Amino acid sequence: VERIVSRDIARGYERIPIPCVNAVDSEPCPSNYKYVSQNCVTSPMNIDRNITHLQYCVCIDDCSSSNCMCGQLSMRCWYDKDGRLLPEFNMAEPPLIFECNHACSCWRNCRNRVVQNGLRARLQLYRTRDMGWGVRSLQDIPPGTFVCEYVGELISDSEADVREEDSYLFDLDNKDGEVYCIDARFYGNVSRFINHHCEPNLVPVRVFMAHQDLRFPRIAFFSTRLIEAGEQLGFDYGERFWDIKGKLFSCRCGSPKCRHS
Amino acid sequence: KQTARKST
Ligand SMILES: Nc1ncnc2c1ncn2[C@@H]1O[C@H](CSCC[C@H](N)C(=O)O)[C@@H](O)[C@H]1O
Ligand SMILES: [Zn+2]
Ligand SMILES: [Zn+2]
Ligand SMILES: [Zn+2]
Ligand SMILES: [Zn+2]
């Protein structure tokens, strides 16, 4: 039967609690990592935070017009009045999103600000039957909604390559060269617990907010369809995960269209 | 790579 093993895994760092429950076994709330709500570093990363390097808009409205320069950078502003991605948004090949920033002329409540407002969906960490811990939604999530950010320790591609515990690494760029990675193993938020699914209800999108250093996008998960209350969250970890892990275990997502079973 | 990486 269900036991609530934590009131809030985030210790009050998010806008709402993220409880943890276990209806499967005797395990308490996972505690072998440090919950952080924003990315951190160990070794320095030298993100370009020169305020004069920001591209910004000069909008006199709420940034919902054709003329918003931040929208232009994003191709167009993809957010509707409710903060959801427009039906036209390419989920198969997402564009980079540039949200408004502190250099823009607009107000803090303009249209082009969603990820920077943080996690607001009611989520729950729970014990799955056969994939360890997972994350579910406690309420219906309409399509195109921002759900959570992949947060953790920002490291180099080189450093990521010597991290023995590799289950929580997320590459920020797929190219060769100077590339960075978020490791959610030691420091991470709720997204570290999101399991892989071959027909996923989340898609990761690269987003820029307070800085526009292209080496360091932030990773935001948006829903790809209506997620019903109770449903487990999942995204496609991608081939660079399964190329390594597929030699060790098979995918248990359960999709008829599973590509890693 | 030597380690598993999630990616877009
Ligand atoms: N679709 C899937 N099939 C089998 N194992 C999965 C899976 N998705 C995630 N996992 C497991 O979870 C790891 C990613 S970390 C995700 C959270 C994890 N379930 C935990 O309890 O900490 C993978 O290496 C694998 O061990
Ligand atoms: Zn604007
Ligand atoms: Zn702007
Ligand atoms: Zn704006
Ligand atoms: Zn699968």
DSSP letters of A196-213? E-SS-SEEEEEEESS---
d(CA A146, CA A153): 21
Residues in B touching A240 (Cβ below 8 Å): 1, 4-7
Token digits of residue A257: 């269209």
Resolution in Å, one decimal, please. 1.6
- A161 to chain B, closest Cα gap in Å: 5
Q: Which of A36, A106, A27 is nearest to A71 (CA)?
A: A106
Residue A198 in contact with ligand 1 by CB distance below 6 A: no
Q: What type of residue is A193? A: F
Contact A54, A101 (CB under 8 A): yes
Contact A89, A224 (CB under 8 A): no
- Beta pairing partners, A79: A85
Residue B1, CA distances (Å) to A53, A146, A169, A219, A241 in order: 33, 30, 12, 21, 10
Residues in B touching A243 (Cβ below 8 Å): 4
Q: How far is the CA of A60 from the centre of ligand 4 (A)?
A: 9
Q: Which of A180, A188, A224 is nearest to A205 (CA)?
A: A224
Q: Which helix (H) or strand (E) holds A240?
A: helix A239-245
Q: Which of A110, A98, A96 is nearest to A54 (CA)?
A: A98
Residues in B touching A163 (Cβ below 8 Å): 3
Q: Strand A195-196 to strand A234-235: parallel, antiparallel, or no bridges (unpaired)?
A: parallel
Token digits of residue A142: 């309409």
In A14-162, DSSP assigns E strands to: 20-22, 34-35, 97-98, 123-127, 133-137, 146-150, 152-156
Q: For residue A14, give the DSSP letter.
A: S
Contact A250, A261 (CB under 8 A): yes
d(CA B4, CA A105): 42
Q: Strand A218-223 to strand A202-208: parallel, antiparallel, or no bridges (unpaired)?
A: antiparallel
- Beta pairing partners, A153: A40, A183
In chain A, DSSP assigns E strands to: 3-6, 20-22, 34-35, 97-98, 123-127, 133-137, 146-150, 152-156, 169-171, 180-188, 195-196, 202-208, 218-223, 234-235
Contact A164, A190 (CB under 8 A): no
Q: Which of A244, A251, A121 is nearest to A195 (CA)?
A: A251
Contact A84, A97 (CB under 8 A): no
Q: Which of A157, A205, A238 sits opposite B6 (nearest CB)?
A: A238
Contact A65, A18 (CB under 8 A): no
- DSSP H helices, A68-196, are 69-73, 157-160
Annotated binding site of A for Zn(2+): 57, 59, 63, 68, 70, 100, 104, 106, 110, 198, 251, 253, 258
Radius of gyration in angstroms for the set of CA atoms belonging to chain B, rounded to a whole number:
7
CB atoms B1 and A206 under 8 Å: no
What 3-state DSSP class applies to A91? coil
Annotated binding site of A: 57, 59, 63, 68, 70, 100, 104, 106, 110, 131-133, 168, 195-196, 198, 251-253, 258
Residue A195 in contact with ligand 1 by CB distance below 6 A: yes
CB atoms A94 and B8 under 8 Å: yes
Radius of gyration in angstroms for the set of CA atoms belonging to chain A, rounded to a whole number:
19
d(CA A229, CA A13): 23
CB atoms A244 and B7 under 8 Å: no
Q: Does domain A1-261 have CATH number 2.40.160.20?
A: no
Contact A91, A97 (CB under 8 A): no
In A57-177, DSSP assigns E strands to: 97-98, 123-127, 133-137, 146-150, 152-156, 169-171
Domain spans in chain A, listed from the N-terminal domain onward? 1-261
Angle at A72 between CA A82 and CA A180, to 5 degrees: 90
Q: Which of A132, A97, A102, A123 is nearest to A203 (CA)?
A: A97
d(CA A58, CA A71): 12
Token digits of residue A35: 């919950």
How many other β-carbons are positioned within 10 Å of the β-carbon of residue A76? Answer: 14
- B4 to chain A, closest Cα gap in Å: 4
Contact A56, A103 (CB under 8 A): yes
Q: Which of residues 1-8 of B touch A (CB under 8 A)?
A: 1-8
Structural method = X-ray
